Design an enzyme around this catalytic site. Sequence first.
Site, PDB file in Angstrom:
ATOM      1  N   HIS A   1       0.842  -1.222   0.000  1.00 38.26           N
ATOM      2  CA  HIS A   1       0.000   0.000   0.000  1.00 38.26           C
ATOM      3  C   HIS A   1       0.873   1.266   0.000  1.00 38.26           C
ATOM      4  O   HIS A   1       0.305   2.356  -0.101  1.00 38.26           O
ATOM      5  CB  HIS A   1      -1.082  -0.053   1.095  1.00 38.26           C
ATOM      6  CG  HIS A   1      -0.622   0.316   2.467  1.00 38.26           C
ATOM      7  ND1 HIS A   1      -0.812  -0.530   3.556  1.00 38.26           N
ATOM      8  CD2 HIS A   1      -0.013   1.412   2.944  1.00 38.26           C
ATOM      9  CE1 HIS A   1      -0.354   0.045   4.645  1.00 38.26           C
ATOM     10  NE2 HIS A   1       0.149   1.229   4.305  1.00 38.26           N
TER      11      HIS A   1
ATOM     12  N   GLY B   1       2.575   6.609   9.418  1.00 38.09           N
ATOM     13  CA  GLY B   1       4.007   6.499   9.097  1.00 38.09           C
ATOM     14  C   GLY B   1       4.625   5.234   9.672  1.00 38.09           C
ATOM     15  O   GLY B   1       5.797   4.958   9.301  1.00 38.09           O
TER      16      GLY B   1
ATOM     17  N   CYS C   1       3.579   2.062   9.286  1.00 38.81           N
ATOM     18  CA  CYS C   1       3.422   0.884   8.410  1.00 38.81           C
ATOM     19  C   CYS C   1       4.817   0.419   7.978  1.00 38.81           C
ATOM     20  O   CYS C   1       5.702   1.247   7.824  1.00 38.81           O
ATOM     21  CB  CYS C   1       2.444   1.149   7.269  1.00 38.81           C
ATOM     22  SG  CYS C   1       0.755   1.475   7.861  1.00 38.81           S
TER      23      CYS C   1
END
Lengths: 304, 304
Positions: free
Chosen positions: B41, B143, B145
């Site tokens: 993603h 932030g 991830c």
Amino acid sequence: SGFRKMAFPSGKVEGCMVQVTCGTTTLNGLWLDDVVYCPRHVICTSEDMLNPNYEDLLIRKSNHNFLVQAGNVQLRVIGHSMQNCVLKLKVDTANPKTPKYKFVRIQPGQTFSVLACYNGSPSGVYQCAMRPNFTIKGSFLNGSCGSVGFNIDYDCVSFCYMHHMELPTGVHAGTDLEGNFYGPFVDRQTAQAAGTDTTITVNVLAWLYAAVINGDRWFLNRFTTTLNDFNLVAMKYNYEPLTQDHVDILGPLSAQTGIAVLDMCASLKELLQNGMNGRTILGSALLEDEFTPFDVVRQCSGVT
Amino acid sequence: SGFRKMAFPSGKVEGCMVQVTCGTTTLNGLWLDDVVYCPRHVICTSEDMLNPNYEDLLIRKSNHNFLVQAGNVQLRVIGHSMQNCVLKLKVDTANPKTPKYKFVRIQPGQTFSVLACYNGSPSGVYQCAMRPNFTIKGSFLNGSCGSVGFNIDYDCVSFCYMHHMELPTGVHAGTDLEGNFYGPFVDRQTAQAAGTDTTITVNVLAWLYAAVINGDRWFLNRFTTTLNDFNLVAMKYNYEPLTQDHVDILGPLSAQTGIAVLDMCASLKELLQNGMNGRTILGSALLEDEFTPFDVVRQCSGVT
Ligand SMILES: OCC1(c2ccccn2)CCCC1
Ligand SMILES: OCC1(c2ccccn2)CCCC1
């Protein structure tokens, strides 16, 4: 979102841990530049610990009696001195992994990460607070002495704790990195009782703000209070007194959430008087006091 | 003595964290050998996330669109592929700090350390469990991830988790390092409800043994039970069923303490039925389920 009891990343400290052996005693040392710092009780037999005269025990020790191992490589000891309750072993090699660092003496209620070590090797990391009675509630087995407590500010490790003692009640006592004990404790196997382990009020309030920020709001009530009124209830529940200094420190969290500090005090007052009635706050059934206001802002903002 | 929620020392993992930027999206990557692993993603706008077609979005991306920064040095991307829900960015430089490592898919109830990172930089480390509903209760801001979950066996990092998603209920979902989600979750901003977050019974029993070992014994009672009887009470309290496999796994702790597992089940049964009556166990007012039997033995023995 979510709020966890979070330790500092331990890598910078892992790079400083060594094994120190004097005779049959092995514990941990902290290698910064060309100095290894370790508890002076490394020179004691368990028998010595009942009534040690450290100056007299130290006379019998030479540089070559202090075996310092960093990984599987031996460091050469070229000097040794006692400063308060720590030994400083001068070695001929600066630690190549020395981070930027400071030695700080923290106040009660301040939090720090411990890197638990055995034989100079890291086993784990956890977050602690210095208790108002100058004990810490750690996880320390035999061999863990010389394990250290630290804070990190970007790239600078502030060392605040070195592990020395378990009290007969199973709580922990140690020194700053100048070898001065927190509280009235001594490196002697003797009757040492801790005082009242009071709750760190300002930390509980910070964690209530963290709870609001993270969606846990059921404990917010319609009340306010005053510092004096709150403090009467705090005294009754063995909570530390709240000062205007603490109110000021909570200002940014007050601002962010729009809950006045004294309103949050009135919420905390009801929780003390009424209990949790089987509910939880941030997955805790008790009021958590091992997050400082600074901790809550750091974790809620994502500082690295 | 003492028993703490303890994370693995994070240094070996700190050495693997990088920043990955695709367009306006920055998150974290894991650099092992000459591959950087990150959530797919990274290629999505927040708008894309409502209904992303990853294969179609990826067609528009070249090696040079993936900006990989390790400290303040850029890595050259020489290849990219999608495996399930992760991207594998081939870079021209093997990570010099690559530890011995494995990719493992953990079972529900298994615990691991998370190194929370923002812009490729470690902010903190904490201990998690994979919940029986395949969520984790983490601390993850925007932030975070690509932050990873791991176990360490002496010098080998077993990576088990990469952070992808916060569900609208504020719990966390992610993948193993083959990019397969734990549970039924998808990398889409859509209605995803977790199932029943049941208590990890075998972990609670392990922690009760840890409590006995550490002097907290007030909850030990005069009763025993059977697996079937205990399991009726467990079902009622949204506790995971206890199997003979779990009894076997608790054998060493049973042996050490001399408390038969079924006797400890009968203690746990009374605690479920009667509650804590305002008492604590290892400083918890609720039954802790984020220590495995292996965790309790590791911490109670001092493995490094
Ligand atoms: O924020 C509190 C916790 C949570 C709850 C729900 C989702 C994510 N994280 C529970 C225990 C620690 C983390
Ligand atoms: O063992 C449980 C704890 C403790 C209690 C007393 C002394 C030392 N350690 C409390 C919370 C975590 C550590």
